[model samples]
Target: SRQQRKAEIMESIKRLYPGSVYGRLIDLCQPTQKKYQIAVTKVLGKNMDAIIVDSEKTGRDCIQYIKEQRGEPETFLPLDYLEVKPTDEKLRELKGAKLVIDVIRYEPPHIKKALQYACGNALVCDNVEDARRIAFGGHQRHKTVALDGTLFQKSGVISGGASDLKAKARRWDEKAVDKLKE
Candidate 1:
């Protein structure tokens, strides 16, 4: 019932503005490799649950519609307003680091920009040590994340540990075979 409650809001919003709501970012992506799951999850963070909209106007309209009905708050990403910076060519030269955007799979190819906006030029390293090195031992400091959800920001902050939201960040839904049979 709770799922349906939230679903109704999104469903109504979709009907009210056809083709405007593109669904949640998490639904749009899957890790390219299983090992990259935590990296993808850490990089995306709450943006994974954000609704992707066609335009800024559509986003504003949807927010107004939800507010009028007193619906639960939701984050919206207007594709048109998102600015994606070009990936650094130098990041490729960094050892043990791979671009976060490259490790995730998204459909409609054009939506890649959305992933780019979420991931920025962040790189995923094999370990926190490698993350620190890639983030600090470079001409241009970069945001780096390790496989275990540890993050080293270019701003000189280090976040260590697994994410509480990791379950929701799953790249794909696991089939509930036992539940289906039961």
Candidate 2:
């Protein structure tokens, strides 16, 4: 129900403001490597579906439109207002892990900051062993998430098991689909 409602609101907003709508964050980015899809999805989590708007003015207008239509509340990432946290430079040297921000690709380049905001400082490891080692055995514990979607946090907390949430960071390419069909 939320999905359909979201589409309805977004469709109407885009119609009213042509270039102001940039679509949902999930629709804006995808894993650079297919194997990192789950990891990226896990890091983005609740923010995956946040709509990206051109500016705070546009975002506010969209919210007003939703309320007028009696639509459910939705999150919006306005490009002009998005401010991301500074990542730990030392973590860049961490072995056996890649920053989640660097593992995904998005268009227009300006949207990169919005994607970085969702990723934070989470690192993605190829295996759980590396994630555990990097998360627990390191000098500075980090929020390390594995490819399987398991999350190991600095607080000695662990999360995830057989995630059923089917969210994806990447959208399908119609050209690729047509090529495959041929």
Candidate 3:
């Protein structure tokens, strides 16, 4: 069933770009095998016009793998430099036009706030997080916590800074945390 789906999609790609070879990256909940990733890039890196990676670290790995496979240095455009499709109003009714920019791209706290104000939500904070990245945040990071689970009593002027306290950093999962349904 999956093999049939692959063939069907491959044919679609063929019709879309008659002479071009294409490949896409996938990093998600299901584990991505490194060998498969490396193998595909060797083939994908072969014809890289609109080719690139999502980050610098992954891009470096692709280049290194392509180098090893082809015996020459190679390059892939990182997503930061790649345009995320056009938002032209004239093309809005077209078959494949994007209506708007992806929302989750504004993931940063300050940037999200700025964009909200830009869209005329200037006075009120609609999506404010009370707990935040600090202690008691909803995502389960024991932030700014004491080692023995007790708050420090004295100020740092006389006694040394509270070395026992540690900020419990939350583990980042791109697929889970940053995913947008659309």
Candidate 4:
């Protein structure tokens, strides 16, 4: 809900600046952790700029909402610029920079993946989502999850698991079983 509110506020920002508010968006909403709310203000301050929305059709029921709000446009991010996945290197790259995503609602695996995606390797078990393998207690047959983020400067991967899911899952947690009822 807060994100929705932020998006709406950003829409307001776009409505005003309509020239090039994007950089301001990045600044205002730096994706900092909730614990660092004050830091966001301390860093960016209140005033921010805005940007555009390129398409009028399909992207919108716009033919109506635009008519309702009496909106105008001036800023937009172009699709012509782009690039591409996976690896702890990317995760390690996020250190000192806050990484945030929408999966926080489900803390266990999401938090771990987000952390892996941001700071360390959460390990790679084939039935990756199985929390038990990540840690099921007492049995303690965990495997090393090589972080591309945790990776050494050699640009090498040590190990996250096995080439296969069952093997990897077994290595991580000998007691791991099929939750899909296999």
* lDDT scores in order: 0.78, 0.79, 0.28, 0.29
The window of 10 residues in a row where model 1 has the poorest summed lDDT is 170-179
Candidates 1 and 2 compared by TM-score, better number? 1
Candidate 2 lDDT, 1-182, residue by residue in tens: 87688789789988987788888776677678778877777778778769888789999999999999898788988877888777666677866877888888887787866876888788999889989988888677888899888888888788986436343423334324545888
Check candidate 2 and list the clashing pairs: none
Point to the candidate with the largest TM-score.
Answer: 1
Clashes of each: 0, 0, 0, 8
Task: Tell me the lDDT of candidate 4.
Answer: 0.29
Model 1 lDDT tens row, 1-182 = 76566779988998888777878787666788778877787788889778888889998999999899888889998888888787667666757777888788886666766887898888888877888887888787888888888888889988876657467444444423323655
What would the TM-scores of all predictions be? 0.85, 0.84, 0.22, 0.20
**Candidate 3 lDDT tens digits, 54-172:** 44555565555445544334334444434333333442232221111211133322222222221111011111132122223323322121222222111211112323212111111
The ten-residue window of minimal lDDT in model 4 covers: 145-154
* Distance from true location, Cα of 50 in model 2, Å: 0.3
Question: TM-score-based ranking, best first?
Answer: 1, 2, 3, 4
**Colliding residue pairs in candidate 4:** 21-49, 21-50, 52-75, 52-76, 88-148, 88-149, 89-148, 89-149
Q: Which regions of candidate 2 fall more than 4 Å away from where they truly are?
A: 166-182
Candidate 2: minimum summed lDDT over ten consecutive residues — where? 166-175
Better TM-score candidate (1, 4): 1
TM-score quality measure for candidate 4: 0.20
lDDT, model 1, position 85 = 84
